[PDB]
Design a protein around this ligand. Structure first.
Ligand SMILES: *Cc1c(COP(=O)(O)O)cnc(C)c1O
Ligand SMILES: *Cc1c(COP(=O)(O)O)cnc(C)c1O
Ligand SMILES: *Cc1c(COP(=O)(O)O)cnc(C)c1O
Ligand SMILES: *Cc1c(COP(=O)(O)O)cnc(C)c1O
Lengths: 398, 398, 398, 398
């Protein structure tokens, strides 16, 4: 292992990890300096060779590293207790480069039916070009996973947990055991969880990736990807990264480094407001169903308590109406923004049906759980009383 | 007033005030855009005249305003419930331009003996050049204040509350009543308080100013000044501001706007860690004395209790030793940085005697409460446990 | 197409294109605002649907667009006279996404032996998984391009011009004609040229791509990729871009927008110095050979003369000596930095043999023109004399 | 002394001064890092004392210095060949703090009738409060300067050169001689000149100040002040600066440092385009008069030519018409923005009468040379022919 022996809490680590004990870019400043350079120089050809023969250290070129960015790399690696972390231009950049680098051509992949749409698309339209075939199972169906592990020769099992938008959870520890038994790799996307509500690496997953665009940055003002794990693995991705070059700008790395100084304070507040609002809603006449790993209704709520310490700040529920009525509800809200993304100080609402499946036919949408009813609420950091009042006032107009 | 009728808590306000309902710089973005421009253009001379005849609105020149900065102006004005707010390059810039604009040549000023040093210096070396004579009383001595208000024709009473470094408090409501009776103006520097722990304006003060470099920004990465109050008054300062031009850079205004999205979460935490640690220290056999409005041993813990809701994140205490021993203690700490300033996520420690009065003789230092013993601790946002352990471990080396 | 009818010079265009006539993000500011947002909101579900049915415009999510970035997109599109431009995280990101989006699986690609190493690697190790196969010819050998354009069906001919590090040039017009005859696509990497020294699009190329990390940004403080061309084509890449998500940060987009305000002034000076010094060196005894399209000795000086108004700021030459001696020369220089990259105000020197092929055996290096002799000089914007003096003084130590 | 012995041109200096040989903030990066911190920490009380006893170096607090800012301080000091330079929040901030720090209470000041308005106001409404009396002479009237230098005791002679908006010049060398004879101090505002077109320090002036908001930054996206001169003098201002705290933000310091990498390339084009267009304008039947030091009709063209290598990028001329007609002209232009400020890549036009004296009566305006006729043109860096075409086309509508 860990950063500091005098830092035993994730909050204290999220703050000082990668900085308090030293930075690499020496300063007597309190904060990390933003280094805007596209290249690094050498004093003499002699030293350039040293570095080339691994006798000296240097990023050499901007596509291969940056001082103000490694800090953020070491900081996250600490939280996840990972051996090494790789930062990218975005979440989709992290998932994509990782799949291309770890799954061989032709090899098999296994994921749930709740896989992030964009990623599903990439897995079903691009990856096949290399013979890579897959198996889409149910988040819960471990039997399915078990079997696929035997007929086909699975290369990697990829899944998020919680899941979007129904927040389905996966038993990281159990799933990790099965896969490794048959040699498969396990990668968990803890975007909704956060490295504070769960330690996918600790539970057995080989790699844990995030979309820092959400909770990590937490201020809805920057995109970024995340992938932590063992050097041996993460460095294989880092290589293909140096070729595809989806590098992260130092200014972005800083906005995140800064945003993580209050990761704990933020996540804590979201967790409450979330849980608390869940119950209120689930017990509302105008709310048909409510999805939240905290509720007892949740199918894997037993897994949520056994592997998570918090249940997140995202809550999905179905209003008692139709596309139009549900819409009237979200239009009635006054604090959240009707927009995509989640995890930031500002609250956000959206109808997954209209916001991300409008391109499909009502039958094709429902073909995968998405209903005109479904509403996805990302609870901000505003006052619980202010929020709740707003949600209720809105449900009344329905 | 109130920004929004659906926003009743300071936390929700600190977040959406000046943005949620509209910005002036129209966007469909969630955040405020950083506008890096030194000048604003007009479409045709016709429109330039309109503006000149107050028929159109424009900042015209950068020294007179900026889109990404008014947001922060309107945001703070909301929290303080002020009619208008003016942002500057720094805290000292705010105090200084205000004194120069509101106190006439020859006029009289009244402040406590605990007045911020730099400001005391400005009041005792610069202001006299303009005939401005001053009276220095004790923060508590309300009698002296009442006499000055009677002998001389006081122009303005300026004081911070809490005070530095002993955190002395002033009865804003009482003091405000006396002054206004004799026509004096009252300006309170709520830097240590924060617009969350108290409402200087509500209690009667005419103007409340802050040093956003501390708690408002909260990330130890930007300097800024603050002055909120009624238009009639704050606009008089704004004018002199356009001539002295200590403008605030848009990039600074944004780093603060961002920093204020978690003001409540941060202050709240800082309020605990402080009060609690204040109690442990008070009961420690190695700590000679402890200053904190939250404690009962505080001279004005009774005034602080009635006019404030929280007690700040700063705690001053005297170790049981001398310059050298006290130093050994701070050198023993492992989490805080030995440095100036306070109010940010990172904890900071300093010995006011060495850090700000080393230029004076031991006799001149003690001539105003500063002892080689005194330690000033700005509690970060790290875990209370990690913090408590560190402070104790250090006190043991003594 | 032309941006403005009142702007007839590339210099005036590089400056006002995408801004002077309007921005989309309305302001009375002179410059483009940096919009730091990860998502864009909608006023009511109604408007969200409009947008979804192409009745309204919005970027929706940050991975799909940004106000402060389109400006830079429209600005470059103007310079190249392109129908549309796409900006990415880096040069390698631009090349890579384009290849993956335009060349089908099993398809065929054709490029020169002077192809950018990293890109060659991607073409020889990654692309093959998709069944894609390539044909590597000589920059000059047009007969080969002709044969290859026949024996096997070519999907796209990709080449840079000038080339690195020998600056070989390709007859864009001729080459474009042959390919299109056999239905192949033509993509030219004008990195070294700049949209000012040549118009690959005008000469017939379908797509022209750049690495804005070099000349476009011109200050060695930001990475970025570029791809301009017809909507029909560039939009196909833009799509795969929204999945692979190697988005460009708004802060980067601005640093480049800003850097292009002096693109013309910079390229001009770099152009003169390059040429003149090119000449001086060629006559210098200690200098063996000199590569520069400007010189009369350049194999394709006629094509350079024919399709370029400028010859760039990069000059490659071989010192009279060996790895060690050549090194002693570059170590003797005092103004340039020994480092990778080029195109910025600061001059830079490097020995391609040590800096990018050290991983290969002397025999494998020479196996492709790279010699321990070869030096690559990127002329800055410093004064011509200061530079000449320095280069001569250094050549004397040899 | 000078910066580097291998850098003999102002262009090479503007680029590498304060960086090429070292920065203080150690890096292997090519550019200067932006250090966003409000405080600097110490390793142990021991070292804090060292620093306090001038045995160690540190900025201590942000109001007292910053790493990314000193670079810009050392860079400008090099250009002006000054002993030390102080950077502020704006030009007005630099002028103001300097006057308050150098002119004693009751002291006497001497300046021209063409003094920057804002500054004149400060000198005529604030300074008198401390009894600082002033003498306003004609830029040319040296006899008056000799008399005032002999009647009342002059403390400092302050003037800009060229002047605004008529660009009047002052013989720095002669004026410097007279003042120093009578002990007066000489401060020259070279804003319009630039440290490239003249060396006020070399000509004898004690202090030379600039408004980096104009030419130095050159991109119309940042405000900043400047004051260079001998340590003994500049440090006296730096002190009062630490109290009034109108500090410069590191992000601003960087935008300027970056903007100065092409100071020479930009000033060159502005120098030409200006001069040339001045002639063409004076030869036009619709232009009543033209002010430019480079013209032969300029009252001090003989002094300009003698102490200047360029004449600036600003040109003021009077159209043959009235407020309304002149307006119709500027409204007809298509490239420049109708706005305040000057010195940047984008061209700007304005009518000093409407833009800065509209508050006065026609009689009061004319009371000081400002006519409804007067137009002030700040030539950008756009192409000369695009600029000339536009100006002519507009003059035709008149
Ligand atoms: C948002 C999200 C992503 C995409 O991350 P970007 O930063 O937008 O690329 C991937 N996975 C999950 C589960 C997400 O919620
Ligand atoms: C820090 C502080 C100031 C000074 O503010 P700056 O931002 O440093 O100028 C003024 N008053 C108090 C009470 C402070 O704590
Ligand atoms: C530098 C360069 C690239 C790579 O661009 P990045 O911005 O480093 O990814 C590609 N092609 C050429 C010809 C280059 O010179
Ligand atoms: C613009 C200008 C100033 C004012 O500088 P700011 O940066 O606007 O405060 C002072 N003097 C002259 C001569 C100017 O041209």
């Amino acid at each position: 292992m860990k950063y500091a022996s005098f830092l035993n809490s994730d909050g204290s680590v999220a703050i000082h990890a990668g900085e308090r004990l030293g930075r690499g870019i020496v300063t007597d400043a309190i904060t990390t300096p933003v280094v805007n350079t596209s290249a690094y120089f050498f004093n003499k050809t002699s030293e350039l060779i040293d570095f080339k023969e691994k006798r000296r250290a240097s990023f050499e070129y901007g596509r291969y590293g940056n001082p103000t960015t490694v800090v953020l790399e070491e900081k996250i690696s600490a939280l996840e207790g990972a051996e090494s972390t790789l930062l990218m231009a975005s979440g989709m950049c992290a998932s994509t480069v990782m799949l291309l680098a770890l799954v061989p051509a032709g090899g098999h992949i296994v994921t749930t039916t709740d896989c992030y749409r964009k990623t599903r698309i990439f897995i079903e339209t691009i990856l096949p070009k290399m013979g890579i075939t897959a198996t889409v199972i149910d988040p819960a169906d471990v039997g399915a996973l078990e079997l696929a592990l035997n007929q086909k020769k699975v290369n990697l099992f990829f899944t998020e947990s919680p899941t979007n938008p129904f927040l389905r959870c996966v038993d990281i520890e159990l799933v990790s055991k099965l896969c490794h038994e048959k040699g498969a790799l396990v990668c968990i996307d803890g975007t909704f969880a956060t490295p504070l509500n769960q330690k996918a690496l600790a539970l057995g997953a080989d790699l844990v990736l995030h979309s820092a665009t959400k909770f990590l940055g937490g201020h809805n003002d920057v995109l970024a990807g995340c992938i932590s794990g063992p050097l041996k693995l993460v460095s294989e991705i880092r290589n293909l990264h140096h070729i595809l070059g989806g590098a992260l700008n130092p200014n972005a790395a800083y906005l995140i480094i800064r945003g993580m100084k209050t990761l704990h304070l933020r996540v804590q507040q979201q967790n409450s407001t979330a849980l608390r609002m869940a119950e209120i809603l689930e017990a509302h006449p105008k709310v048909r169903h409510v999805y939240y790993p905290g509720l007892q209704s949740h199918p894997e709520h037993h897994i949520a308590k056994k592997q998570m310490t918090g249940f997140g700040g995202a809550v999905s529920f179905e209003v008692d109406g139709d596309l139009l009525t549900t819409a009237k509800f979200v239009d009635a809200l006054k604090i959240p923004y009707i927009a995509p993304s989640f995890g930031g100080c500002e609250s956000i609402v959206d109808q997954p049906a209209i916001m991300s499946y409008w391109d499909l036919s009502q039958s094709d949408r429902a073909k995968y759980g998405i209903m005109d009813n479904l509403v996805r609420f990302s609870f901000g950091v505003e006052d619980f009383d202010d929020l709740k009042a707003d949600i209720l006032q809105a449900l009344d107009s329905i």
